[PDB]
Amino acid sequence: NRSLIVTTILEEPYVLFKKSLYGNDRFEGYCIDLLRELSTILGFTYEIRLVEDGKYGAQDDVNGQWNGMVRELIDHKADLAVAPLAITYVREKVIDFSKPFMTLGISILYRKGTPIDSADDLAKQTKIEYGAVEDGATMTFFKKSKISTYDKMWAFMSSRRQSVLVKSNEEGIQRVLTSDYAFLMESTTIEFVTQRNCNLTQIGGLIDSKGYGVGTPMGSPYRDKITIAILQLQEEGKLHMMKEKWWRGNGCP
Amino acid sequence: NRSLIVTTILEEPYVLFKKSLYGNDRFEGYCIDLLRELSTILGFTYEIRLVEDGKYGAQDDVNGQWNGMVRELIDHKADLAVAPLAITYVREKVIDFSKPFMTLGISILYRKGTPIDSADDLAKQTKIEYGAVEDGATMTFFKKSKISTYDKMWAFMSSRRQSVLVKSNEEGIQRVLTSDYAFLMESTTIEFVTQRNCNLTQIGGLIDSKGYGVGTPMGSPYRDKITIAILQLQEEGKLHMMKEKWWRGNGCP
Ligand SMILES: O=S1(=O)NCN(C2CC2)c2ccc(F)cc21
Ligand SMILES: O=S1(=O)NCN(C2CC2)c2ccc(F)cc21
Ligand SMILES: N[C@@H](CCC(=O)O)C(=O)O
Ligand SMILES: N[C@@H](CCC(=O)O)C(=O)O
Ligand SMILES: [Cl-]
Ligand SMILES: [Cl-]
Ligand SMILES: [Cl-]
Ligand code: NA
Ligand code: NA
């Protein structure tokens, strides 16, 4: 039976290169553990392939082409995307997702001890720049929002796109550390970053409420199978333990 | 085009009889508002029908028959279940769910000011009885659990099933108020109850992590359409406002 092609992306602590290797043995992380569990529960073999363009996925406003892992699924170049891939309405129109394996919301990463306490605080000023990962779900949330605060924030990011939209979460984190910049990013990843770097904090609450799911091409029979496996891992307490395994850090004052 | 048959159940603040009426105009609540929004977004007409047996749904261990709203969907007697219907692995094997419109977890409802602080505290004693809604998702969670604490709790409830499993959340709440009883119930409904009755509180944290979704017969084309509509309502901020509309209460000290 055919080995499934699994697209994914480098993103700590979900997917990393092991430090030390060939094939699937090159990789470790939460999403690699989830994939292995799914493969033994459902009985498939698989080949992990990092997405060539290093992107999560968004639709181009000029020519309508998608990029990233979403494009890989639209083109049926991969069977599954096992990654921190956010479930969103624009994506469900073109690909399918399993039920979520982790909850998250957009929030703000910044330095500690400042007067900035919300997105509104950022929106009403320009001295502190702010942005998001290019061609990801956070960017697309702001681009499409009709909520006043977030529409104003998108107008700001779009006018400085070259400078404030970054290629990766790692680049956004480094920009917070090296410039007066607040980074719009997902709360799960904020939690990981802030337990390891005590200079950094979440600002405000969660701006939306969604989850990560395993992506498939639309209509794939694997979507329902993976859903059932994820729900069982959740109920058995195994998803919680997988999160505890990878969200570890010395902690901060 | 055919009007969709929608099964639901009486459960404050999701579905209630208006206090004052015919047809769909008899009903109000969060899930009635969600249904109306879905009907205008997707363009369908519908007829609300309360589930005849007053149950959410579980599978009988002797004859394998389901009951409740789940059975209505298995038999294709309803197009949709729009209700506080928990997504679970046993149910996804037999029906389909949209993506979730609300998150919840199992927790404990009890009186304030006591030494009971967790499920473990309940499991290690018998003077305080405890139970759950019969033939709902919480009951089925305990019945199937291999987690030591919850397996012990199921052994206790099953041996006193006649007395500690109740027909409705309302009956469980009243049992907390009139007897030395702790009620295993969903955190969303706990939040509503505890902002209105200052004698009551959540004990401990969330025991699992799941959500409510719109149920459909397996394979229905409405599942994906409803998912996309729910995701848009979430992103636009409308699901949050719908929750604020119905989770209102004078509050407590
Ligand atoms: O993106 S979803 O599938 N649908 C929206 N929700 C919000 C609870 C409405 C959530 C909440 C938690 C999730 F894990 C996933 C989702
Ligand atoms: O029942 S689900 O579709 N899958 C399990 N999860 C837990 C995050 C793993 C969640 C979390 C929040 C939801 F709203 C739904 C679900
Ligand atoms: N996880 C996001 C990428 C990171 C972000 O947008 O903050 C996605 O699925 O597109
Ligand atoms: N909402 C539950 C019923 C209440 C409960 O089990 O606590 C269900 O879908 O079965
Ligand atoms: Cl690769
Ligand atoms: Cl009725
Ligand atoms: Cl789904
Ligand atoms: Na889809
Ligand atoms: Na299903």
Q: Which ligand is nearest to the CA of B216?
A: 9
Q: Do A93 and B236 touch (CB under 8 A)?
A: no
C-alpha–C-alpha distance, residues A25 and B10, integer Å = 52
DSSP readout, A187-243? Answer: HHHHHHHHHH-TTEEEESS-S--EEE--EEETT-THHHHHHHHHHHHHHTTHHHHHH
C-alpha–C-alpha distance, residues A10 and A169, integer Å = 10
In 3D, which of A65, A17, A56 has the Cα closest to residue A215?
A56
| B173, two tokens | 């709440």
Q: Cβ-count burial of A161 within 10 angstroms (0-12 exposed, 13-18 middle, 19+ buried)?
A: exposed
**∠ CA(B31), CA(B32), CA(B38), 5° rounding?**
85
Torsion of CA B226, B232, B237, B238, to 10 degrees: -40
Best residue for ligand 3 mutational test, from A55, A106, A144, A186 (most atoms within 8 Å of Cβ): A186
Torsion of CA B216, B220, B221, B223, to 10 degrees: 30
Instruction: Report the Cα B211 to chain-centroid distance in Å.
Output: 9
Tell me which chain B residues have a C-beta less than 8 angstroms from the C-beta of A87: 99, 231
Q: Are A107 and A138 in contact (CB under 8 A)?
A: no
| Nearest alpha carbon, ligand 4 atom 3 | B136
Q: Are A157 and A140 in contact (CB under 8 A)?
A: no
Interface test mutation site (partner B, options A225, A231, A242, A244, max chain B beta carbons within 10 A): A231
Q: Is the CB of B172 under 6 A from ligand 4?
A: no
Q: Which ligand is nearest to the CA of B231?
A: 1
Contacts of B168 (CB under 8 A, 6+ apart): B11, B54, B133
Which residues does ligand 1 sit against, CB inside 6 Å? Answer: A 87, 100, 103, 209-211; B 99-103, 211, 230-231, 234, 239
Q: Which residues pair with B17 in a beta bridge?
A: B27
Shortest Cα distance, chain A CAs vs residue B99, angstroms: 7
Q: Which ligand is nearest to the CA of B211?
A: 2
Please tell me the number of Cα atoms within 13 Å of A70 on its side-chain side.
27
Q: Do A89 and B147 touch (CB under 8 A)?
A: no
C-alpha–C-alpha distance, residues B199 and A239, integer Å = 34
Interface test mutation site (partner B, options A38, A97, A99, max chain B beta carbons within 10 A): A99
Q: Is the CB of B208 under 6 A from ligand 4?
A: no
Q: Do B240 and A209 touch (CB under 8 A)?
A: yes
Sign, CA dihedral B73-B77-B78-B79, equals positive
Contacts of A139 (CB under 8 A, 6+ apart): A58, A132, A133, A157, A165
C-alpha–C-alpha distance, residues A242 and A59, integer Å = 32
C-alpha–C-alpha distance, residues B175 and B48, integer Å = 30
Tell me which chain B residues have a C-beta less than 8 angstroms from the C-beta of A97: 99
Q: Are A215 and A6 in contact (CB under 8 A)?
A: no
Documented resolution in Å: 1.6
Residues belonging to the binding site of B for L-glutamate are: 84, 86, 91, 137-138, 186
Q: Which residues pair with B211 in a beta bridge?
A: B103
Tally of helices (H runs) and strands (E runs) in chain B: 11, 13
Shortest Cα distance, chain A CAs vs residue B178, angstroms: 32
Convert A32-47 to b/e letters by CB count within 10 Å (16 or more is b). bbbbebbbeeeebebe
Tell me which chain A residues have a C-beta less than 8 angstroms from the C-beta of B210: 231, 234
Which helix (DSSP H) or strand (DSSP E) does residue A106 occupy? strand A106-111
Contacts of B198 (CB under 8 A, 6+ apart): B112, B252, B253
Query: Which residue carries 């928990």 as its tokens?
Result: B86
Q: Are B70 and B136 in contact (CB under 8 A)?
A: no
Q: Which residues pair with A159 in a beta bridge?
A: none
The structural domains of chain A, ordered by start, are 4-103+211-246 (3.40.190.10), 106-203 (3.40.190.10)
C-alpha–C-alpha distance, residues B114 and B180, integer Å = 11
Amino acid at the residue B238: K
| Structure-determination approach | X-ray
Closest residue to A89, CB basis, from B87, B97, B232? B232
Q: Are B4 and B44 in contact (CB under 8 A)?
A: yes
What pairing do the DSSP bridges indicate for beta strands A181-186 and A106-111?
Answer: antiparallel
Radius of gyration of chain B (CA): 18
Residue of A nearest to B228 (CA): A89
Q: Which residues pair with A212 in a beta bridge?
A: A86, A102
Question: Could you count the other beta carbons within 10 Å of the beta carbon of residue B81?
Answer: 27
| Helical residues (DSSP H) of chain A, grouped into ranges | 30-42, 68-74, 89-92, 119-123, 137-144, 148-159, 161-164, 169-178, 187-196, 222-235, 238-246
Q: Is the CB of A234 under 6 A from ligand 2?
A: yes
Which helix (DSSP H) or strand (DSSP E) does residue B130 occupy? strand B129-131
Shortest Cα distance, chain A CAs vs residue B126, angstroms: 25
Q: If DSSP states are collapsed to H, E and C, what string results for B179-213? A: CCEEEEEEHHHHHHHHHHCCCEEEECCCCCCEEEC
Chain discontinuities in chain A, listed by preceding residue (C to N exceeding 2.5 Å): 20
